[PDB]
Design a protein around this ligand. Structure first.
Ligand SMILES: Nc1ncnc2c1ncn2[C@@H]1O[C@H](CSCC[C@H](N)C(=O)O)[C@@H](O)[C@H]1O
Ligand code: NA
Lengths: 264, 264
């Protein structure tokens, strides 16, 4: 059998009891730390907590040799594949389950807290979020913009936008909410849809999962230069607020009391 | 100090290690099972795993008296507030942190798996979900249908719509995917907007969190009367599929081959 087990958001403890119970009694343990950053732990602590040796795999080992490195062992033993947060959220690991099927391997998913639901601690109603997007680093003469249209589309409907920030694990590069805002501003001049400016209200959630995450709401002009701590970060562009969402942003995220005055 | 700790998705093992340890160091432990129930376990088993007695709070005990029942103790003690899923996902829970602030009480959030990220196991891409909704039971002269317009607006833009099904927590009466489909067909007959029909494709997820969840995909006309096992049930109406999504539904969720040409 094959086990996809999420490790959670911040540290090793963010794993579900079920996850740890099963990880402990597995023959082989593999993992990847390229889809996200667990800024609160080390491979050692995970290994010490699990009680097994962990073979960390690269994006390539996975995307090209999952069935060559992991699956073979899964037909004779109980093998676990570990990932940050929930293993099937904002990743392409879901497809790996098909590889397992075609390989004669039974696979199970043990969920864990994901950043996709952790946004609830921002005060924004989770059901009000619309389509999601990723702000990707520009590479060479290629400048990604799609995520800008996502914000626009949701904005018209009154919905919130969750922006997954880019990550270059191998270069130990983790995009900050600031870089994301600087990129959006640049796309705003390029497109001029009045979708993202200095006056746009944004929400920053940094290091969710830690007992002391950074939750900040405010205008780009004021937050674009603010220090939100070490990564990972996520950026949120709220749609039409609800009075209680606004009260939470002000009371808990330190937003300008003037946002309380919702323009229904 | 008080802790909002998520209980997870299905059973008492879905709580995170961090959540279980903290709940054990708490002087008092409250829990609510009105926003949702844990069908994979019991209050007795959760009480035993933590090794603390747990006082259950009704919907009114919380929404009306949270500050007179839970917060008082949090002054000279460490209190735990357990909820199914991930904390603050339930819409009225985030405002409780404002109550905690108002009362001079520090609050921390201990995340856990939520259905919002767990639906990833359907093989649908998270970022493609739009606004979410709850299918409510008609009753008396009230026949709510806004959840239909959500499916309409989401699908229109190629987005998946996550549908929470009704629940009468106290009476422990869940709405089945079947009843939800019957209801939608009935609503389509009302508004006739070509949103939900016998030919519409849907995905039914039952018992997320369990090692053996029920994942089924197919046309309403073939699922409207299928048995998906015991509750809870989540209904999902996908927009235009990504080929990789369709193959997953065909391979893992038992969807018909027809979707590889019809819904891609
Ligand atoms: N604890 C955390 N705090 C803030 N952002 C986080 C985060 N975990 C993930 N992210 C965000 O999501 C990106 C990884 S996307 C993969 C998400 C992961 N499977 C999950 O379930 O969370 C990061 O670059 C960051 O922008
Ligand atoms: Na969503």
């Amino acid at each position: 059998v094959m086990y996809f087990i999420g490790l959670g958001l911040y540290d090793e403890r963010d794993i579900t009891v079920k996850g740890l119970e099963i990880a402990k009694k597995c023959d082989y343990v593999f993992a990847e730390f390229y889809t996200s950053l667990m800024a609160g732990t080390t491979l050692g602590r995970i290994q010490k907590l699990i009680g097994k040796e962990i073979r960390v795999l690269s994006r390539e080992d996975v995307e090209l040799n999952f069935e060559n490195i992991v699956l073979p062992l899964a037909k004779e033993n109980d093998v676990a594949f570990l990932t940050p947060g929930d293993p099937l959220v904002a990743t392409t690991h879901a497809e790996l389950r098909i590889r397992a099927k075609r390989a004669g391997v039974e696979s199970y998913v043990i969920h864990a807290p994901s950043i996709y639901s952790a946004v609830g601690i921002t005060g924004l109603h989770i059901y009000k979020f619309g389509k999601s997007a990723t702000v990707a680093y520009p590479e060479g003469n290629w400048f990604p913009t799609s995520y800008y249209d996502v914000i626009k589309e949701n904005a018209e409907r009154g919905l919130h936008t969750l922006l997954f920030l880019d990550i270059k694990a191998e270069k130990r590069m983790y995009m900050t909410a600031n870089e994301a805002m600087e990129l959006l501003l640049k796309v705003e001049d390029m497109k001029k849809g009045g979708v993202f400016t200095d006056d746009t209200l944004v929400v920053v959630l940094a290091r969710a999962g830690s007992l002391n995450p950074t939750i900040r709401a405010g205008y780009v002009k004021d937050l674009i230069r603010e220090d939100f701590g070490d990564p990972p970060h996520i950026l949120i562009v709220p749609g039409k607020l609800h009075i209680v969402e606004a009260e939470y942003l002000v009371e808990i995220a330190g937003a300008p009391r003037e946002i309380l005055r919702v323009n229904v």
